[PDB]
């Protein structure tokens, strides 16, 4: 037996363990939405759990006793069992083998045939008892509240104080009631990630709440942080059409990049003659780079290693050489030293990765490895990514060397020692530098990413060669020249792209959005409201009822509620009237709204005043025969509140460190 009911305002619990009094607090958490659709059961498979469960029961005899939680409930995984005797409450998480229709035998254990590996145990007018179970993080949180009533779910208000929090990290997907021929009835609802405005009174008790996404009036209340709304029009929020599907478009490339022959080289080159290899027209899977060399981690500048598989690069360059430990810090932008000045220089705007690993086993000889040399003398510093393999004799002094070494005439290159007994800082290190040309031309190196089909004229999440975004893709008239790959706008936003597979042009447009204002008389007068969608025709007003068409989950009836089209936008919920009155709630473009007689909200063209033709003629004059003494009142502000601010007390209240830091700011 399954009936249905509205939850009304039931299911509000204290979101934290902080005392608050006489305050309105906005909290986003898993709450039971107001006026939701709860299921009523009478006394049988297992219900789903979803994100949380609100259980309720009105009783006077305590027939319902416990609960069961888990995923499969067949002793293959841990399951939660909660029972309670007349005095004690027993909670276990054993791997029970539950019966098909468990029930406590009026004690016994007919519920479960087996129970092994118990990893947690805990022991501790009608009456309406309400419980909330949620299994976030590694805690099973149970909130409870029982109140006397004289009704399924009374329209009053009652917060649910937290009862128990269990540190069990159990995964839960299904649950079932438990009771001790008899009859019983109970209500079940499901929690959702909602934002609420809670009202803590003087004693710290939650006395009222507002569900910010229930309807436009509640959204207005949450925006104003108040439970009462004065008459007027309030710019509440923005409506936005959500994307429907995801599109990925990458070049159709099959070859795997040759990263094996870079890291797995028999002998790396000397730093003064560093090797450079070009990687292009291949798919690069950097996650395998950890298998080729025993390096500890990347050192990536301008990019994060974990993201390297999500990007496309026009070209990649692998520069390989061997240095010693002291000089590994010089392979970085903005460095100076022998290696940075005379051997290998990286630009200050370097965007790439550096991979250096110790190779003392391969590059060291007992007598000393002298195959690796570095340039020690040079006239001037190297330009970035410049190689200098010259061996001309360096002239230190004024005497020309004439190709002969001597005093102030040195051989520019010197060999490393590289003996296995040296310390860590003097041992050889193999260095591979990956330089990414980034994406401006047709990308030739891309991460492993399956490309989907192309969807046009819809709000989609697109990913063109790693350029991600959300919008509508339309066929474009822009005359791209063959070398171009995308077009930009005034704000340097990508306005058009080139599909890598079919070399066509696609315009990118923001999906759909606009401002949403709420026209309302005072809440002391009525809860009836109208909605103004600003600057939209009354056809782009989002009508589709789903979770991919609107940021505001509420949807004022777009057909039955009398729609009207003003130059300000589309007005829903107000009936246009051919009469003209004084402006009460200004909507715009000469249109105002008011709450008038049943009573409803009416929109009209504002009235400037009564017309009055003056009986003018060239020999007629109107002269007053009497007068009137009028006393009018004019109010003028003169002064305002004189305020003083203690800068240190406000910014750094009772903090010496903060005050000393604040002294630095002039």
């Amino acid at each position, epitope marked *: 037996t399954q009936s249905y009911t509205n939850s009304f305002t039931r299911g509000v619990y204290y979101p934290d363990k902080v005392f608050r009094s006489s305050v309105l607090h906005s909290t986003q958490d898993l709450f039971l939405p107001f006026f939701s659709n709860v299921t009523w059961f009478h006394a049988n498979p297992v219900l789903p759990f979803n994100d949380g469960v609100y259980f309720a029961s009105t009783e006077k005899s305590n027939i319902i006793r416990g609960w069961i939680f888990g995923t499969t409930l067949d002793s293959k995984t841990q399951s939660l069992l909660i029972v309670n005797n007349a005095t004690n409450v027993v909670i276990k998480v054993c791997e029970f083998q539950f019966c098909n229709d468990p029930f406590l035998d009026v004690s016994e254990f007919r519920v479960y045939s087996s129970a092994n590996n118990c990893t947690f145990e805990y022991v501790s007018f009608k009456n309406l008892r309400e419980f909330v179970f949620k299994n976030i993080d590694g805690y099973f949180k149970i909130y409870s509240k029982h109140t006397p009533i004289n009704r399924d779910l009374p329209q009053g208000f009652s917060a649910l104080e937290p009862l128990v929090d269990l540190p069990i990290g159990i995964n839960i997907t299904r649950f079932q009631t438990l009771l001790a021929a008899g009859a019983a009835a109970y209500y079940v609802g499901y929690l959702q990630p909602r934002t609420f405005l809670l009202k803590y009174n003087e004693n710290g008790t939650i006395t009222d709440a507002v569900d910010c996404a229930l309807d436009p009036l509640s959204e207005t209340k949450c925006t104003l942080k108040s439970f009462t709304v004065e008459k007027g029009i309030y710019q509440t929020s923005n409506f936005r059409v959500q994307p429907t599907e995801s599109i990925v478009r990458f070049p159709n490339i099959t070859n795997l990049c040759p990263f094996d022959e870079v890291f797995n080289a028999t002998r790396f080159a000397s730093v003064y003659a560093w090797n450079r290899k070009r990687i292009s027209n291949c798919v690069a899977d950097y996650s395998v780079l950890y298998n080729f060399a025993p390096f500890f981690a990347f050192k990536c500048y301008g990019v994060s290693p974990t993201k390297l598989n999500d990007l496309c690069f026009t070209n990649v360059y692998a520069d390989s050489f061997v240095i010693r430990g002291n000089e590994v810090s010089q392979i970085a932008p903005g460095q100076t030293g022998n290696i940075a000045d005379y051997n290998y220089k990286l630009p200050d705007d370097f965007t790439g990765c550096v991979i250096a690993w110790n190779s003392n086993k391969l590059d060291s000889k007992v007598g000393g490895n002298y195959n690796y040399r570095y340039r020690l003398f040079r006239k001037s510093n190297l330009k970035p990514f410049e190689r200098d393999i010259s061996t001309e004799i360096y002239q230190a002094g004024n005497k020309p060397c004439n190709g002969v070494a001597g005093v102030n005439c040195y051989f520019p290159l010197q060999s490393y020692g590289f003996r296995p007994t040296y310390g860590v800082g003097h041992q050889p290190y193999r260095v591979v530098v990956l330089s990414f040309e980034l994406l401006h031309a047709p990308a030739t190196v891309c991460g492993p990413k399956k490309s989907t*089909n*192309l969807v*046009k*004229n819809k709000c989609v999440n697109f990913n063109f060669n790693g350029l991600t975004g959300t919008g509508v893709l339309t066929e474009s008239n822009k005359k791209f020249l063959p070398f171009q790959q995308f077009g930009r706008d005034i704000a340097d936003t990508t306005d058009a792209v080139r599909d890598p*597979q*079919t*070399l*066509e042009i696609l315009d990118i447009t923001p999906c759909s959005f606009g401002g949403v204002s709420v026209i309302t008389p005072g809440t002391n007068t009525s809860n009836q409201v109208a909605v103004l969608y600003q600057g939209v025709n009354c056809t782009e007003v989002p009508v589709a009822i789903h979770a991919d068409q609107l940021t505001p989950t509420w949807r004022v009836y777009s057909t039955g509620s009398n729609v009207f089209q003003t130059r300000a936008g589309c007005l829903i919920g107000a009936e246009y009237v051919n009469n003209s009155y004084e402006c009460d709630i200004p909507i715009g473009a000469g249109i105002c709204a008011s709450y008038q007689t049943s009573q409803s909200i009416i929109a009209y063209t504002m009235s400037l005043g009564a017309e009055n033709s003056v009986a003018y003629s060239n020999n007629s004059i109107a002269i007053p025969t009497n007068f009137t003494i009028s006393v009018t009142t004019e109010i003028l502000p003169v002064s305002m509140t004189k305020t003083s601010v203690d800068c240190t007390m406000y910014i750094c209240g009772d903090s010496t460190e903060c005050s000393n830091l604040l002294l630095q700011y002039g």
Partner: antibody
Amino acid sequence: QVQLVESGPGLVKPSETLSLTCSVSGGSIDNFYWSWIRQPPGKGLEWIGNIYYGGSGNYNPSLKSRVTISVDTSKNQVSLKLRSVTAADTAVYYCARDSVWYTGSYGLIYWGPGTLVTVSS
Amino acid sequence: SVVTQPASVSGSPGQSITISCTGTSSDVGSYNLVSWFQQHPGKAPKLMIYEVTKRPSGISNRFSGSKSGNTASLTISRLQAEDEADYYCCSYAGSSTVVFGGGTKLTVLG
């Protein structure tokens, strides 16, 4: 799996307006690009235009001053209208649809059998 | 028609023939969006090649497509009797415009 069937008058006098309706079976209008093409007897194919439910309507520049293509989702059909019909318009007309894997104006995949239209009195 | 095709071509059963499709740099040399259609007399055109090289499901691998410069080529290997029909090339011309070729009539010597 969709089938497109053309219908309309087979005779149009010169300087009149020619109307054709393509009916879709086994599928819906949705967001597909519905295209109209024509072929004179014994001559090559000539692309006329296309339209999707979003709007606008892209026509051949040689004919855009006369062609109007529309789509009706409620009746689930495509409408083609050609004004100032001359004797050169005597041809077999086809409607075509793009697929999900070839979306766009270039998606001429599912063709109808065609309908012959002759221009004379 | 901007796109140009040879008027006719002949071949013997067994050998491979090629049908050319010469356009400009704005229709064929700009996009990988060339389609090849086969039309028998009295029948609607049948899509044989789409996106320059891709074959729709149900089409024999004897038909292959390629593009070079401003010319798209359809290669038919192992000519058979039923392959004798008209062949057209359609190309996306930009700004949501499609241009058809003049049409080529294949002849089978068999």
